[PDB]
Amino acid sequence: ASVERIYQKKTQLEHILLRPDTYIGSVELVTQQMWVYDEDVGINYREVTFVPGLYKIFDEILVNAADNKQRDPKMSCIRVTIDPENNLISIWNNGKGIPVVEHKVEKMYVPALIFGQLLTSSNYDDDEKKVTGGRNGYGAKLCNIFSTKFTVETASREYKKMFKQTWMDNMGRAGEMELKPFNGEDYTCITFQPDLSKFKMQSLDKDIVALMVRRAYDIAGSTKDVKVFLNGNKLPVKGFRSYVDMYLKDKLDETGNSLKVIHEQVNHRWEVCLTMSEKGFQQISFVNSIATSKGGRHVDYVADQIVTKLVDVVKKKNAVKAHQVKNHMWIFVNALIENPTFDSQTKENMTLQPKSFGSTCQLSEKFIKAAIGCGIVESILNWVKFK
Amino acid sequence: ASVERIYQKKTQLEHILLRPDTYIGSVELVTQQMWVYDEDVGINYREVTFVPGLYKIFDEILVNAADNKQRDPKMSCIRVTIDPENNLISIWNNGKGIPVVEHKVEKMYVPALIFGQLLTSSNYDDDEKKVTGGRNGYGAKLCNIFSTKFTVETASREYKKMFKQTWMDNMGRAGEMELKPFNGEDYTCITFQPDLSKFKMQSLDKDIVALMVRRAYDIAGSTKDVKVFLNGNKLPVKGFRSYVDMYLKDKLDETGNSLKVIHEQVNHRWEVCLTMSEKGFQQISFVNSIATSKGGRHVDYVADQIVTKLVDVVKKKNAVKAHQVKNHMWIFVNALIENPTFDSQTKENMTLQPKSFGSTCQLSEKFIKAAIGCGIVESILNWVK
Ligand SMILES: Nc1ncnc2c1ncn2[C@@H]1O[C@H](COP(=O)(O)OP(=O)(O)NP(=O)(O)O)[C@@H](O)[C@H]1O
Ligand SMILES: Nc1ncnc2c1ncn2[C@@H]1O[C@H](COP(=O)(O)OP(=O)(O)NP(=O)(O)O)[C@@H](O)[C@H]1O
Ligand SMILES: [Mg+2]
Ligand SMILES: [Mg+2]
């Protein structure tokens, strides 16, 4: 009844733990069909039960690793370790480390600042037109906050130093900072034990591991010239087309014939695959190696030029609407977008208008022709016949 | 390229202005089809060009007014003023005012705290199972931050005082707090001048007004026993079914016949209308008077029990998929949900699972029967043939 009990102020850290949803997604169970990678089965679509926020904190660190390839093209490798019985995840990358030096304005070492303080980022100057996935200065701190133990190790040959420090108890405490002389090949390694109590979980079970492994395959398929290892084993992905092939390799439509798959690497920032869908519009897409599971204007931009060209082919053969065409399409898009926007930190839907992408993606006349002859025009014409 | 230039830390306020999208949505132009209310023809679906974030800061204040009906059910009225020429918006409501008193913990007057300080809310104790739209403690400060001038006035007969304070320059400064004795009918009035430069706009033009006006119609239809006024004109909505009718006034399908509409007020927290769609699945829904324009589990919870009963009807008469059924559905849902969750501050998609809703919505067998007899079972059954 008290004014002080009714009206409350929260610190930023308190607010994240109290209201996790707009930061990392739901911290409750969801049961739905998802693409996952099962041991001994590979890529497959099945019902899974998982906590989105746990999936996301892993994603934040993984995308950070991919981002470093854009910062340093000499980077060649990402190594992911998932150890359920010790509740341990590690993500390692090479290329240039984080400067191991005191930040003259914030008065702490750079790695401690950008992993241990909210709203810290190298991505706050949008006069630079970057195709990194990082935008907001939260992601790594979010993983820290939802971890019981969160270790940052980064080595900077330029500064001849190596940094290592561990946070604990939801970024509430930090152990001792370790600084050692260094003169090798740079790397960064983030090792964390997710706070499964925040997710009402007891361990990294089969389903969340299958999702995390598939996400590592996503990275292998969406990045260029980065080898990806999962628990010491190299992942056999070479390019986005070979990644898409894992989804469609033996796939048949419902009459029994194999799916017709249309591909174009339109340019160095856009790659597209199209086939037929029997369950409504489907899209699997990436922006700067972020899995945009709810799509966005990058998907609309590519799909719409297919749809309008197909509605024009169907009209020649007569009343059909664009949503009808789109419901027969399964599209794959891998895109690099400058300074993308999203309506949430989880970055599931990319909202930037095409005029601001920094590149274009006009599908070739070769691609469009093959799209006309891939079964979508057929199914539509049988429906208007059977009217 | 110095380390201090590369790696930067932002205050919360700086971060909101630098990265508005996760707080209020896009601050750039968007062109798409929207339901609006034009001073010409009324509710209608047409292409508009508008800035989502400007639309959103208006919504935050409007939903706050609607929230006060849950706080004080004797509240009866909301009045909205939109004045493009002076770039001024006001939202007024009656019912209980904000307590005009010094907060013993934060050591400022309550209205100053909850309109001038980030992460402040009456909605942070989830042991109270409330059906208010406010959850995060941002909305009103976001409107303040994206305004050149932002004025709060609230009168509390209980505290026998009236409060008034004005912020300016993106919540960068505040004027003086004005306190006067008060002994009339409580009210709260929020008046703001949106910072149109932040939205790269020149004035509150035709399209953004039509969106704001339809949103005021939304409030009149989603709330109970609240009259809604816009520029002194009462909005002629009484109950959710009458609001849905404004969408269905032009009631003809593509065959020429009048639209068949199935309705049920399931309980005090759920009201559902269903009609047919020829443009794919459509949903218009609200959670605690939030316009959930991207839907959510409240929509799924309702639509799915319609779909599953229809899929069971087509089997009797035969391989059909659920998306096929859904594509012929245009559904309206007005729900009150306890402590809802959302993907983003903009609250366009409600993510809370049904087991946590705090109520159920099992559609009546009469509703289901009428839904079986609406043409959706018909067209699909000829399709499988
Ligand atoms: N593996 C890494 N290698 C090099 N720099 C890194 C790495 N991970 C993080 N960083 C740096 O640490 C900063 C903070 O990371 P993070 O908190 O994830 O924010 P962000 O990536 O910039 N934006 P976001 O992820 O959208 O919230 C980044 O901006 C990078 O400068
Ligand atoms: N018109 C109003 N009448 C009464 N109380 C109000 C009114 N507007 C705001 N408040 C109070 O001010 C607080 C701050 O509002 P706001 O910043 O919108 O946060 P919120 O509504 O609690 N959550 P959110 O909108 O999801 O960020 C609310 O929790 C209310 O208690
Ligand atoms: Mg990041
Ligand atoms: Mg609010």
Author numbering:
A (entry chain A): 28 to 345, 350 to 418
B (entry chain B): 28 to 345, 350 to 416
What is the paper's account of this structure, in its own sentences?
Topoisomerase II (TOP2) enzymes are essential regulators of DNA topology during DNA transcription, replication, and repair. Topoisomerase IIβ (TOP2B) plays a role in transcriptional regulation and is expressed in all cell types including post-mitotic cardiomyocytes. Both isoforms catalyze the reaction, where one DNA duplex is passed through a transient double-strand DNA break in another DNA duplex. The ATPase domain of TOP2 is highly conserved between TOP2A and TOP2B and is composed of an N-terminal strap, a β-hairpin that is unique to eukaryotic TOP2, a GHKL ATPase domain that binds and hydrolyses ATP, and a transducer domain that conveys mechanical motion to the DNA binding and cleavage core of TOP2. Here we describe the development of the obex class of TOP2 inhibitors that bind to a previously unidentified druggable pocket in the TOP2 ATPase domain to act as allosteric catalytic inhibitors by locking the ATPase domain conformation with the capability of isoform-selective inhibition.
Topoisomerase IIα (TOP2A) untangles DNA pre-catenanes during DNA replication to permit chromosome condensation and segregation in mitosis, and is primarily expressed in proliferating cells. We have been unable to obtain crystal structures of nucleotide-free eukaryotic ATPase domains, and to our knowledge none have yet been described to date. Therefore, a comparison of the AMPPNP and AMPPNP + obex inhibitor structures reveal that the obex binding site is pre-formed in the ATP-bound state of TOP2, suggesting that topobexin (9) fits into TOP2B like a key into a lock and blocks subsequent conformational changes that could otherwise occur upon ATP hydrolysis. Residues surrounding the 5c pocket are largely unchanged from those observed in its absence, suggesting the ATP-bound state can easily accommodate 5c. Interestingly, 5c induces a slight shift in Y72 of TOP2A compared to apo TOP2A due to packing of this non-conserved residue against the hydroxyethyl group, while the equivalent C88 residue in TOP2B is located 4.7 Å away and does not interact with 5c.
